[PDB]
Structures are given as structure tokens and as C-alpha cells.
Design an enzyme around this catalytic site. Structure first.
Site, short mmCIF file in Angstrom:
data_model
loop_
_atom_site.label_atom_id
_atom_site.label_comp_id
_atom_site.label_asym_id
_atom_site.label_seq_id
_atom_site.Cartn_x
_atom_site.Cartn_y
_atom_site.Cartn_z
N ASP A 285 0.80 -1.22 0.00
CA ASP A 285 0.00 0.00 0.00
C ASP A 285 0.84 1.28 0.00
O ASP A 285 0.50 2.23 -0.70
CB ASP A 285 -0.96 -0.01 1.18
CG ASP A 285 -1.83 -1.21 1.19
OD1 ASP A 285 -1.98 -1.87 0.15
OD2 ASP A 285 -2.36 -1.50 2.27
N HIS B 289 -4.99 -2.20 2.13
CA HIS B 289 -5.30 -3.56 2.57
C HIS B 289 -5.54 -3.56 4.07
O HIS B 289 -4.73 -3.04 4.84
CB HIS B 289 -4.14 -4.50 2.23
CG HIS B 289 -4.05 -4.89 0.78
ND1 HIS B 289 -3.52 -4.06 -0.19
CD2 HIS B 289 -4.39 -6.04 0.15
CE1 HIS B 289 -3.56 -4.68 -1.36
NE2 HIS B 289 -4.08 -5.88 -1.18
#
Lengths: 148, 148, 148
Positions: B24, B72
Site C-alpha cells: 500500500d 489492505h
């Protein structure tokens, strides 16, 4: 009881995860082994069931036959030790799933209110109380696998 | 190996978080340092890549170029110790993101199936297996920052 | 400081959970007791408030009066020990809620950037920095309880 403390914490986080995993992966074994015999699983708007017997009874007769599949995301497990043998706890949980009814995808936000108890050095659920904060069927979305 | 146990748990929760964070925040460093050289990252519907080499290869050539950004959410890390040196584990993971394709916002529900291994007292990924339960582009929603 | 390490970790995960719980269950007590007096809670697009005083000031004058109710899901708490007494940390957080404005249901994805500090063996927030990655009102969905 300072190492012993951290140990209990671990023990319970696994119990909490196992509650959730055993509902989503529909694993009878995993699910039945976390309840003391006089434990109560209460889910607001459904009812109370007591013991592993009742836990498995709800799983097979209400939960599983209602949803094609669910996935529960469990976070924020916040424990409070009342004695080195009794713990209270909150968790916030997010759940996604397809209802058999109307083949609907829905979102539940829940708050679980828990009670853990030790017996012969072993930790199990005493009481789990489910309270649904949000129940929202999603209008123009259907959760599907990547192959549709 | 009871303190040692709790220690491993910690060690791995960080590894698991680091897998996710490194995808991410797109941090090559963070991401490359968690894989043993013979480790396999498998993502269903993409393929298998082996070693940190392959991990970084997937990151740069498939994942990152496919999404403008992802986030996530990782929960329910449920570990099972097979020996004080090998662990299996499940996690449920929720991911939100914008595909470059059609500038689409989408929701992935995944289940990760893991294997951890200790070598010279140090813990790393042996195998990560990604399985996407839900892949759902959201019809009338586009995830944006607050300034649009 | 290896047992001591695991202990701190626990201590902080509770602090992190308590930040979140105290905003969602609107519990002044829980919320005020986690900040050192010179601590700064910054939320991008709102402002900075300092100390428990300021924490409670934001809660009562901005956050709570803006949303009918919120639920924050906190995951991926990834800690880094700078000294046995100062820790930096990231968490990804998902939040669902109803704005009073237009009675709107919305989704915030945030990243929290934290700093923890020990004083007299006790752990508290030094700095919390909120950054909103996604702010998305949901078009045709309103989060409601199951009884509507």
C-alpha cells in the site's frame, strides 16, 4: 502473572479469531471447541443458544442456511482483566455476505460483547453477545468471486 | 519456549502487517526483507513468484502499475505452531482501491494462507497464498481523497 | 527488556484500540486517559488539538456533533521501537458512519501516524496524526440498524 498475562491475551485472541473463522470457513471442529458447556452465544434479533451443543445448533440451522457465504473481519479486541481468571472484552466486527434470500449482498457492522473464563489453566468463552449496529443490503452490488 | 512463543507471534504479526503495508505505501525496502530466498508468493489468477526477487518483480510489474492506490486491511491472523520453527496461518483481508483500467474503484475480499519459518533465530515468510473470495467493482462509487 | 518489550506492545495496542473505541462509543473517560499533557492529536482537514483537554474538546465540539454515529475498524498496527521508551507506528483504519449533514452514510479510509512515550513505566500517546486517504459519501446506501 505478568508473563501469564500476555499468555492469556494470546489465548483469547485466538479464541476470538476462531469464533469468526469457524463461521466463515464452516468448520464444526474449530467452532465447537471454544465454548464452556454453560456458555451463552446471544445474537440480537435471533436468540440465545447455550453450550457448544447450541453453538453448533445455531451454526447448522440458522447461520449457514441463511447465507451462501460470509466473511467476518474482526478488529479492536479490547480486554479488561477482572481477575487473572475472568475477562470482559469488546470487538468491532465487519461482515460481508450473500443472503440466500433474494441472492442479496449485505453488510453487517456488529459489536461483540464477550466474557472469558479460565478452568484448569484453559481459556474458553463464557458469554458472547452479538449486537448488530448496521444491517444494510447493498442496492446495486453483488459480491462475487473473480470468475463471474 | 513459552516466552519464546509469544515472541515469535509478535515477530510474525509484524511480518504480516509488513507484507500489507509494503504493498500500500509502495515501500520496496519493507517488502523485500520479509521473504526467505526460496519463498513463494502466489496470488490466484495472477501466478506464483519466488524469493524477494520475485516479490519485487510482481510489485513493480503487475500490482503497482494496475492500481492508482490500494489499502489492505488485515485481520484475524490465526497461527498454528507445527514446530517451534514452522507456522501455518490464515488471515482475512479486505482491500479497497482504484484500478487504472477505467479508473474504477473496487473491493477485494481475500483469504491469505501462509507458512512461516525460522532460520538462525530469525523469522520470515516461507509461502504466502492469496485467494480472492470477492472481486467487486463498485458501480456508482469512486473512492477519492477529501479534496475533490 | 525482551519480556518488557512484549508488555509495551500490549500496552499500546490497548491505547490504539481505546482511541477508536472512545470515539465510537463516545466514552469521555476512556478517551481522556490516553494522552500525555503535551500530546497532539492532528486530523488533516480539521486541525491540531493538544493534551487530553484538547482531545475532549475536539470530541465534543466537532466529531460527535458531526456524525449520528461512527464505527472505526483499526488494523495493521505496525510498531517500531526507537528506544525502550519511544515508539513510532502506523495503522490503517476503516470508518463507517452517518453524517448529520444530509443524513448521509460515508466511508473514510484513514492512515494514522503515531508516537508513543513512556513516563514512570506508563505508556501514553505522544502524537497522533490522522490522514484521510478516502472520503466517500455512498450514493444509494444508508447504514441503518436492523429495525428500520
Amino acid at each position: 502473572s505478568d508473563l501469564d498475562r500476555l499468555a492469556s491475551r494470546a489465548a483469547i485472541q485466538d479464541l476470538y479469531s476462531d469464533q469468526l473463522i469457524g463461521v466463515d470457513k464452516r468448520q464444526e471442529g474449530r467452532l465447537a471447541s471454544i465454548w464452556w458447556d454453560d456458555a451463552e452465544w446471544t445474537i440480537e434479533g435471533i436468540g440465545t443458544y447455550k453450550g457448544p451443543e447450541g453453538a453448533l445448533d445455531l451454526a447448522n440451522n440458522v447461520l449457514w442456511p441463511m447465507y451462501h457465504e460470509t466473511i467476518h473481519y474482526g478488529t479492536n479486541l479490547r480486554l479488561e482483566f477482572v481477575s487473572a481468571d475472568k475477562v470482559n472484552g469488546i470487538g468491532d466486527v465487519l461482515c460481508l455476505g450473500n443472503l440466500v434470500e433474494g441472492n442479496q449482498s449485505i453488510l453487517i457492522a456488529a459489536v461483540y460483547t464477550n466474557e472469558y473464563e479460565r478452568r484448569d489453566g484453559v481459556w474458553k468463552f463464557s458469554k458472547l453477545n452479538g449486537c448488530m449496529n448496521y444491517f444494510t443490503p447493498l442496492a446495486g452490488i453483488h459480491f462475487a468471486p473473480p470468475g463471474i
